[PDB]
Design a protein around this motif. Sequence first.
Motif, PDB file in Angstrom:
ATOM      1  N   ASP A 132       0.846  -1.182   0.000  1.00  0.00           N
ATOM      2  CA  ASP A 132       0.000   0.000   0.000  1.00  0.00           C
ATOM      3  C   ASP A 132       0.872   1.219   0.000  1.00  0.00           C
ATOM      4  OD1 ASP A 132      -1.072   2.365   1.951  1.00  0.00           O
ATOM      5  OD2 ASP A 132      -2.764   1.469   0.952  1.00  0.00           O
ATOM      6  N   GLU A 133       1.888   1.238   0.844  1.00  0.00           N
ATOM      7  CA  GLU A 133       2.849   2.333   0.989  1.00  0.00           C
ATOM      8  C   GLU A 133       3.629   2.626  -0.315  1.00  0.00           C
ATOM      9  OE1 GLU A 133       5.334   2.887   4.758  1.00  0.00           O
ATOM     10  OE2 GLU A 133       6.852   1.859   3.551  1.00  0.00           O
ATOM     11  N   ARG A 134       4.294   1.647  -0.920  1.00  0.00           N
ATOM     12  CA  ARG A 134       4.983   1.974  -2.161  1.00  0.00           C
ATOM     13  C   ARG A 134       3.979   2.656  -3.098  1.00  0.00           C
ATOM     14  NH1 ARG A 134       8.140  -0.021  -5.457  1.00  0.00           N
ATOM     15  NH2 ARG A 134      10.287   0.343  -4.773  1.00  0.00           N
ATOM     16  N   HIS A 135       2.847   1.988  -3.337  1.00  0.00           N
ATOM     17  CA  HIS A 135       1.801   2.446  -4.240  1.00  0.00           C
ATOM     18  C   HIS A 135       1.268   3.870  -4.107  1.00  0.00           C
ATOM     19  CE1 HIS A 135      -2.448   2.541  -5.660  1.00  0.00           C
ATOM     20  NE2 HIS A 135      -1.926   1.934  -6.714  1.00  0.00           N
ATOM     21  N   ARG A 136       0.945   4.326  -2.890  1.00  0.00           N
ATOM     22  CA  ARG A 136       0.362   5.663  -2.722  1.00  0.00           C
ATOM     23  C   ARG A 136       1.400   6.711  -2.550  1.00  0.00           C
ATOM     24  NH1 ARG A 136      -3.663   3.603   0.532  1.00  0.00           N
ATOM     25  NH2 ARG A 136      -4.701   5.616   0.243  1.00  0.00           N
ATOM     26  N   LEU A 137       2.609   6.245  -2.294  1.00  0.00           N
ATOM     27  CA  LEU A 137       3.720   7.147  -2.199  1.00  0.00           C
ATOM     28  C   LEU A 137       4.062   7.423  -3.673  1.00  0.00           C
ATOM     29  CD1 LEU A 137       4.881   8.326   0.378  1.00  0.00           C
ATOM     30  CD2 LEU A 137       6.209   6.124   0.521  1.00  0.00           C
ATOM     31  N   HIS A 138       3.930   6.441  -4.563  1.00  0.00           N
ATOM     32  CA  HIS A 138       4.242   6.713  -5.968  1.00  0.00           C
ATOM     33  C   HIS A 138       3.154   7.577  -6.648  1.00  0.00           C
ATOM     34  CE1 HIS A 138       6.544   6.486  -9.512  1.00  0.00           C
ATOM     35  NE2 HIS A 138       5.396   6.409 -10.172  1.00  0.00           N
ATOM     36  N   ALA A 139       1.901   7.368  -6.226  1.00  0.00           N
ATOM     37  CA  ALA A 139       0.743   8.085  -6.737  1.00  0.00           C
ATOM     38  C   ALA A 139       0.698   9.557  -6.351  1.00  0.00           C
ATOM     39  CB  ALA A 139      -0.517   7.391  -6.276  1.00  0.00           C
ATOM     40  N   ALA A 140       1.462   9.937  -5.329  1.00  0.00           N
ATOM     41  CA  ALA A 140       1.553  11.326  -4.846  1.00  0.00           C
ATOM     42  C   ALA A 140       2.422  12.223  -5.730  1.00  0.00           C
ATOM     43  CB  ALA A 140       2.154  11.340  -3.435  1.00  0.00           C
ATOM     44  N   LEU A 141       3.237  11.598  -6.576  1.00  0.00           N
ATOM     45  CA  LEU A 141       4.171  12.312  -7.406  1.00  0.00           C
ATOM     46  C   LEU A 141       3.487  13.077  -8.502  1.00  0.00           C
ATOM     47  CD1 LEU A 141       7.320  12.686  -7.942  1.00  0.00           C
ATOM     48  CD2 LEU A 141       7.030  10.873  -9.660  1.00  0.00           C
ATOM     49  N   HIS A 142       3.896  14.330  -8.649  1.00  0.00           N
ATOM     50  CA  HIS A 142       3.380  15.233  -9.659  1.00  0.00           C
ATOM     51  C   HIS A 142       1.958  15.579  -9.479  1.00  0.00           C
ATOM     52  CE1 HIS A 142       7.146  14.839 -11.448  1.00  0.00           C
ATOM     53  NE2 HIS A 142       6.929  13.687 -12.063  1.00  0.00           N
ATOM     54  N   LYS A 143       1.466  15.369  -8.263  1.00  0.00           N
ATOM     55  CA  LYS A 143       0.087  15.663  -7.869  1.00  0.00           C
ATOM     56  C   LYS A 143      -0.010  16.656  -6.711  1.00  0.00           C
ATOM     57  CE  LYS A 143      -1.518  11.370  -9.568  1.00  0.00           C
ATOM     58  NZ  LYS A 143      -1.353  12.126 -10.928  1.00  0.00           N
ATOM     59  N   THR A 144      -1.173  17.273  -6.561  1.00  0.00           N
ATOM     60  CA  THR A 144      -1.460  18.216  -5.482  1.00  0.00           C
ATOM     61  C   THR A 144      -1.815  17.429  -4.191  1.00  0.00           C
ATOM     62  OG1 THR A 144      -2.443  19.859  -7.041  1.00  0.00           O
ATOM     63  CG2 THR A 144      -3.059  20.020  -4.673  1.00  0.00           C
ATOM     64  N   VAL A 145      -1.120  17.661  -3.074  1.00  0.00           N
ATOM     65  CA  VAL A 145      -1.471  16.940  -1.822  1.00  0.00           C
ATOM     66  C   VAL A 145      -1.809  17.850  -0.658  1.00  0.00           C
ATOM     67  CG1 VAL A 145      -0.041  14.915  -2.353  1.00  0.00           C
ATOM     68  CG2 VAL A 145       0.949  16.732  -0.914  1.00  0.00           C
ATOM     69  N   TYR A 146      -2.611  17.386   0.265  1.00  0.00           N
ATOM     70  CA  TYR A 146      -2.863  18.251   1.397  1.00  0.00           C
ATOM     71  C   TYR A 146      -2.189  17.543   2.539  1.00  0.00           C
ATOM     72  CZ  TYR A 146      -5.146  19.875   5.671  1.00  0.00           C
ATOM     73  OH  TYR A 146      -5.360  20.405   6.935  1.00  0.00           O
ATOM     74  N   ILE A 147      -1.127  18.115   3.101  1.00  0.00           N
ATOM     75  CA  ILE A 147      -0.562  17.442   4.250  1.00  0.00           C
ATOM     76  C   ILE A 147      -0.680  18.339   5.473  1.00  0.00           C
ATOM     77  CG2 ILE A 147       1.545  17.385   2.778  1.00  0.00           C
ATOM     78  CD1 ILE A 147       2.193  18.647   5.156  1.00  0.00           C
ATOM     79  N   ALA A 148      -0.964  17.744   6.617  1.00  0.00           N
ATOM     80  CA  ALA A 148      -1.126  18.546   7.812  1.00  0.00           C
ATOM     81  C   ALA A 148      -0.855  17.821   9.090  1.00  0.00           C
ATOM     82  CB  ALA A 148      -2.586  19.101   7.907  1.00  0.00           C
ATOM     83  N   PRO A 149      -0.774  18.594  10.182  1.00  0.00           N
ATOM     84  CA  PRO A 149      -0.557  18.086  11.527  1.00  0.00           C
ATOM     85  C   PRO A 149      -1.942  17.909  12.217  1.00  0.00           C
ATOM     86  CG  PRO A 149      -0.031  20.372  11.494  1.00  0.00           C
ATOM     87  CD  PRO A 149      -0.256  19.972  10.063  1.00  0.00           C
ATOM     88  N   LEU A 150      -2.033  16.957  13.142  1.00  0.00           N
ATOM     89  CA  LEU A 150      -3.282  16.745  13.840  1.00  0.00           C
ATOM     90  C   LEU A 150      -3.232  17.598  15.095  1.00  0.00           C
ATOM     91  CD1 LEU A 150      -3.966  12.901  13.420  1.00  0.00           C
ATOM     92  CD2 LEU A 150      -4.615  14.849  11.993  1.00  0.00           C
ATOM     93  N   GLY A 151      -4.352  18.228  15.410  1.00  0.00           N
ATOM     94  CA  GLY A 151      -4.376  19.065  16.594  1.00  0.00           C
ATOM     95  C   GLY A 151      -4.920  18.114  17.613  1.00  0.00           C
ATOM     96  N   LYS A 152      -5.749  18.592  18.514  1.00  0.00           N
ATOM     97  CA  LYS A 152      -6.221  17.602  19.440  1.00  0.00           C
ATOM     98  C   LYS A 152      -7.717  17.290  19.406  1.00  0.00           C
ATOM     99  CE  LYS A 152      -3.307  17.550  23.234  1.00  0.00           C
ATOM    100  NZ  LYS A 152      -2.292  18.279  24.088  1.00  0.00           N
ATOM    101  N   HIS A 153      -8.003  16.232  18.658  1.00  0.00           N
ATOM    102  CA  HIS A 153      -9.325  15.656  18.376  1.00  0.00           C
ATOM    103  C   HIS A 153      -8.791  14.721  17.306  1.00  0.00           C
ATOM    104  CE1 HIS A 153      -8.337  19.552  16.700  1.00  0.00           C
ATOM    105  NE2 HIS A 153      -9.092  19.424  15.624  1.00  0.00           N
ATOM    106  N   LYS A 154      -7.462  14.780  17.208  1.00  0.00           N
ATOM    107  CA  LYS A 154      -6.657  14.036  16.275  1.00  0.00           C
ATOM    108  C   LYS A 154      -7.169  14.242  14.865  1.00  0.00           C
ATOM    109  CE  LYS A 154      -5.738  12.333  20.526  1.00  0.00           C
ATOM    110  NZ  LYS A 154      -6.720  11.304  21.062  1.00  0.00           N
ATOM    111  N   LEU A 155      -7.636  15.459  14.561  1.00  0.00           N
ATOM    112  CA  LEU A 155      -8.116  15.836  13.215  1.00  0.00           C
ATOM    113  C   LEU A 155      -7.164  16.904  12.702  1.00  0.00           C
ATOM    114  CD1 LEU A 155     -11.942  15.776  13.791  1.00  0.00           C
ATOM    115  CD2 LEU A 155     -10.591  14.234  12.458  1.00  0.00           C
ATOM    116  N   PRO A 156      -6.999  17.076  11.371  1.00  0.00           N
ATOM    117  CA  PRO A 156      -6.088  18.104  10.829  1.00  0.00           C
ATOM    118  C   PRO A 156      -6.236  19.483  11.473  1.00  0.00           C
ATOM    119  CG  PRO A 156      -6.672  16.715   9.017  1.00  0.00           C
ATOM    120  CD  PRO A 156      -7.511  16.240  10.264  1.00  0.00           C
TER     121      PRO A 156
END
Length: 311
Positions: A132-156
């Motif tokens: 799963d990891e190789r696959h979605r790590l490869h799918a992230a390339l050349h694409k727009t991603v939303y990455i974030a930290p979790l606050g406390k409710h463990k939500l972005p």
Amino acid sequence: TEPVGSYARAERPQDFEGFVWRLDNDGKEALPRNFRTSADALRAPEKKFHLDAAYVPSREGMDALHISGSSAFTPAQLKNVAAKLREKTAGPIYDVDLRQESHGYLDGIPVSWYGERDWANLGKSQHEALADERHRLHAALHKTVYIAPLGKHKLPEGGEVRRVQKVQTEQEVAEAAGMRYFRIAATDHVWPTPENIDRFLAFYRTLPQDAWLHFHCEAGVGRTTAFMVMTDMLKNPSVSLKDILYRQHEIGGFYYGEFPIKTKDKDSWKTKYYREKIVMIEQFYRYVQENRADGYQTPWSVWLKSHPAKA
């Protein structure tokens, strides 16, 4: 109903599907969080555990343990870790990745694919989890991603969005840090599985006498202390459960002996896994003691099967 040591098998994976790219670390500090060495001084025990603040635990074996822990880190942080460790040893240093969650590096930003409770890969086999990891790590390339930290409710909470230009695997960041790499796909807030431990036992038995093991999980508390403790048990079968448990907690890890479990209303589900961890870690000490002489021939899984623990 599951027998102790396997409570996690009762949960439904389809109910914790990954949904966000969690920011595993901000790369602000030179070192990852909760960094510690078996070569460190003990400190007073933390109140939450209600231990005996005046009990001085034994250090037999610590100097030769050659073990350490830490949270996830950025490529730079990994180099700083590898540098602090090269000051204490000269043997081969191992980055021992304990995450079942699919994690890697997007443009150098350390991220993991996050599902509630961090179980996006619950129930998968280690082979499947890494697929799963190789696959979605490869799918992230050349694409727009939303990455974030979790606050406390463990939500972005904030974060950033970018178009990914570089994609990396944890193993590749390790090799760039001069470290060797070894992955044990363990689920986040639970007792490692018989598969997990059998795998760590086989790798442990082939280690160079001077190898240095650097364990890390997401925050570097539970899974990493669990493995730091079994390596302590495994390598110093001579010292007592008490000392090892007080030991690994007083240099900055978790306390794995019984204590009064307190949770937030949101986390009630954790309680049984805290109690189950307490039982299994004593069963593992029991296994170290009854096969230490033998040839640790019999794997933890075959032994566990005919020496079940009870709740």
